[PDB]
């Protein structure tokens, strides 16, 4: 870690505000080292071959470190502040700026650093700590792992380093394409029919693993063979529809104890092509209220660049009859 | 007159062995000015039922009105807490820790919480929990408001409330026996007197107005003499619990008001006699809407684990320590 990170950090303070290495058990023979800028989120290319062109500086001829940005765990915040209305001077705007902020002086202090760990129990005493007349947060979270590639997931897995419940891992939604032509005069003679999916897990077994299946399908712009076939369960979250579409499909698979994470769409003859995206973002209830990092994940706040992990639901009181 | 003037008069002429004065008047029961007092050490003044609440009696000046000196209505806090620490961080033991964090969760209560109409929040308490090592790393917590009900067999007169908001099917008492008439036999041993199962009191989701009913049960088809009013509940609405005896068949015996906030029942409404149940007190947990719980009026939020202890638990989780290179 910080044998070649300090340094580093020393020709390069200005802008990255954490940085650490490490080995990939299986990509043998390569270092890695994440670094994230103060400034942000992902370090610029230009700032990336500059950092790495400071390995001729120190002489080494084997291919040599390759910097790159840090595994982000994301937290989903659902917060909840009930306040005093008496002792509530400015907005409920204004409130709202006044703790985020206290969340983002929590997270720079004590969380994001690599290994350093988010408590949902230290955060809201953080909240409560914003104003004199925050009389008692609550708060309900999830983890956001940001998917680089939708079609499958990396050779070796994809993990939160946590406990996540049952049922709980789930990505958003992608449009996938059939191939089917709709025949509509409003936009022309033909669009091509594309309807929303998502990939989410089942239930643990016998033995603690579950099925990582893909979203909602029309029975013929998926082909089955023996072997590939609907997948019936019903032990996970099935998604809203206004469309007869009932066909979840199975690829890869969720260890839940261990953590890892494996799919390739590739399972059900699909090809990326076939699907209008290439990034996603999985998600998942933790099992604890205290969410840990390891090597090169970095938890992380960012709020006026990712202002959709964080909600605010205040609560105006006075005296009393009633607060829900 | 004046209840602030009752206080003070209190706070002087016993200001010795009491911490706190709440002079309310119930608007249900006239002509009575209530006075609670919390005894600035235990729970229960004159718990030997007045030596103490009957000197304070013995104080008059002017009205027609009465003085009813009686002890604080209590909310307790069923905490389920689940701190967890770092295995290295920590230096003593899982038991001197636990006698670490309970100071503090004292230090919360008695500071902010244990007064009149002062309140309790639970952020504010797992504040302090974690705030009691240098690892200690974070905390997790369940509460339930628990109401401590003498005379299990009927409420009060005009209900009992929690001077908060509750959940649907969140009023639910603990367990106690009751004596069914009827007599079994097994290993070998006889008549075994009369068969007992475990019985309890729940709420169900609110109506279309607020309201939903305060059951009981379950029983056999049973143990419950079934009238034109008396008839089982008619449909699933609520919890029902372990029938390792099999039974269920509960029966409506009052009401909560969620909005007004009041509980009522009474077992005579169906037609068993006290006699028929072991009890005398019980307990009556709800978990609130609230993420911050109200005292109020004669209503106190106290902490007293010493005396109480049945309303905490803490689980503790070590943690294997990170990165220890460098």
């Known amino acids: 870690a910080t044998d070649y990170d300090t340094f580093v950090s020393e020709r390069f303070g200005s802008i990255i505000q954490a940085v650490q290495t490490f080995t990939d058990?299986?990509?043998?023979?390569?270092?890695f080292i994440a670094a994230k800028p103060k400034s942000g989120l992902y370090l610029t290319t230009?700032?990336?071959?500059?950092?790495?062109?400071?390995?001729?500086?120190?002489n080494l001829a084997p291919i040599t470190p390759s910097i790159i940005s840090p595994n982000y765990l994301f937290i989903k915040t659902n917060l909840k502040v009930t306040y005093a209305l008496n002792k509530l001077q400015e907005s409920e705007q204004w409130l709202e700026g006044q703790i985020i902020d206290k969340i983002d002086r929590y997270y720079t202090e004590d969380v994001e650093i690599f290994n350093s760990s988010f408590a949902k129990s230290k955060m809201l005493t953080y909240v409560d700590d914003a104003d004199h007349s925050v009389i008692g947060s609550s708060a309900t979270i999830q983890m956001v792992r940001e998917v680089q590639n939708f079609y499958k997931t990396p050779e070796a897995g994809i993990k939160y380093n946590n406990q996540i419940k049952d049922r709980s891992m789930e990505s958003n939604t992608f449009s996938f394409n059939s191939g089917r032509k709709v025949v509509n005069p409003d936009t022309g003679?033909?669009?091509?029919?594309?309807?929303?999916?998502?990939?989410?897990?089942?239930?643990?077994?016998?033995?603690?693993?579950?099925?990582?299946?893909?979203?909602?399908?029309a029975s013929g712009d998926v082909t089955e063979n023996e072997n590939i076939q609907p997948y019936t369960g019903n032990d996970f979250?099935?998604?809203?529809?206004?469309?007869?579409?009932?066909?979840?499909y199975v690829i890869g698979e969720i260890n839940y104890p261990a953590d890892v994470i494996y799919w390739n769409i590739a399972k059900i003859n699909l090809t990326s092509?076939?699907?209008?995206?290439?990034?996603?973002?999985?998600?998942?209830?933790?099992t604890d209220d205290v969410i840990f990092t390891r090597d090169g994940s970095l938890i992380v706040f960012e709020n006026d660049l990712r202002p959709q992990y964080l909600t605010?639901?205040?609560?105006?009181?006075?005296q009393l009859e009633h607060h829900h």
């Open 25 to 31: 058990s299986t990509k043998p023979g390569y270092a």
């Open 46 to 58: 230009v700032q990336r071959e500059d950092i790495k062109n400071y390995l001729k500086d120190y």
């Open 189 to 217: 003679l033909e669009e091509d029919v594309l309807y929303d999916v998502r990939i989410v897990s089942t239930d643990r077994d016998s033995k603690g693993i579950g099925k990582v299946i893909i979203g909602p399908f």
């Open 237 to 248: 979250n099935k998604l809203a529809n206004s469309d007869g579409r009932d066909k979840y």
């Open 273 to 286: 092509e076939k699907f209008e995206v290439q990034t996603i973002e999985l998600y998942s209830d933790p």
């Open 312 to 318: 605010i639901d205040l609560e105006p009181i006075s």
